[PDB]
Amino acid sequence: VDMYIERAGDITWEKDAEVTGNSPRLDVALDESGDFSLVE
Amino acid sequence: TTDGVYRVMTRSTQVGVGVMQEGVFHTMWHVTKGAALRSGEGRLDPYWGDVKQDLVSYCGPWKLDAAWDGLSEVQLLAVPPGERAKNIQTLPGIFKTKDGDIGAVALDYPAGTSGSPILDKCGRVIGLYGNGVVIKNGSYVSAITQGKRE
Ligand SMILES: N=C(N)N[C@@H]1CCCCNC(=O)[C@H](CCCCN)NC(=O)[C@H](Cc2ccc3ccccc3c2)NC(=O)Cc2cccc(c2)CNC(=O)CNC1=O
Known part of the structure; x- marks a missing residue:
């Protein structure tokens, strides 16, 4: 399997972007395999 | 490189x-x-x-090594499969864990967007997108995952 990288852009903050998405406050656990879960 | x-x-x-x-x-x-x-x-x-x-x-x-300041809006520089890079500004939420709080962005993109950088207002990379949780409505929230610079 040929895994390869290709440039996609410059890393630059964009001025005058409008905020989207909410800001959830979540109780979370992280296991030793790197998986996050929600604490119920 | x-x-x-x-x-x-x-x-x-x-x-x-x-x-x-x-x-x-x-x-x-x-x-x-x-x-x-x-x-x-x-x-x-x-x-x-x-x-x-x-x-x-x-x-x-x-x-x-840049860190989210816990206060400010950030930008996901999303690079979705088949689409040009685009900046999405958001105020992170928080993953509250037994080992501390981690900023988290409520932005949902295809699996192949994993690794896209999240930026502070100076353009520094405060972490990478794509390890997260699925909430009750089916949408996704990603940790702002940052490594340690030794
Ligand atoms: N709305 C959804 N599901 N959006 C996701 C957005 C993916 C963004 C990039 N990240 C990933 O691919 C990682 C890989 C794995 C890294 C693991 N350490 N992924 C994830 O973190 C999650 C992990 C996960 C999974 C289930 C959880 C349930 C409860 C609580 C927490 C949970 C966490 N994995 C997924 O979300 C997998 C998935 C679950 C349900 C449905 C889909 C995909 C179909 N969606 C897509 O086919 C594209 N979108 C999507 O796949």
Whole structure:
């Protein structure tokens, strides 16, 4: 399997972007395999 | 290894994204599982990684050390499969864990967007997108995953 990288852009903050998405406050656990879960 | 954001492809399908900074390529472990990466005519080998953090670096140690300030809006520089890079500004939420709080962005993109960088207002990479949770309505929230610069 040929895994390869290709440039996609410059890393630059964009001025005058409008905020989207909410800001959830979540109780979370992280296991030793790197998986996050929600604490119920 | 010029600085910038890159797609991670398999031959093609886009399986992720990563950041080249200071000669080191940074992505999420689940994107490559440490496999070698072709870059033009060269090969990049894994140097450091951690399954629990879900991070891997190539060519040298992890270089990204900017931290979310816990207060300010951030930008996901999303590089979705088949689409141009785009900046999405958001106020992070919080993953509250037994080991501390981690900023988290409520932005939902295809699996192959994994590794896209999240930026502060100075353009520094405060972490990578794509290890997260699915909430009750089916939408996604990603940790702002940052490594340690030793
Ligand atoms: N709305 C959804 N599901 N959006 C996701 C957005 C993916 C962004 C990039 N990240 C990933 O691919 C990682 C890989 C794995 C890294 C693991 N350490 N992924 C994830 O973190 C999650 C992990 C996960 C999974 C289930 C959880 C349930 C409860 C609580 C927490 C949970 C966490 N994995 C997924 O979300 C997998 C998934 C679950 C349900 C449905 C889909 C995909 C179909 N969606 C897509 O086919 C594209 N979108 C999507 O796949």
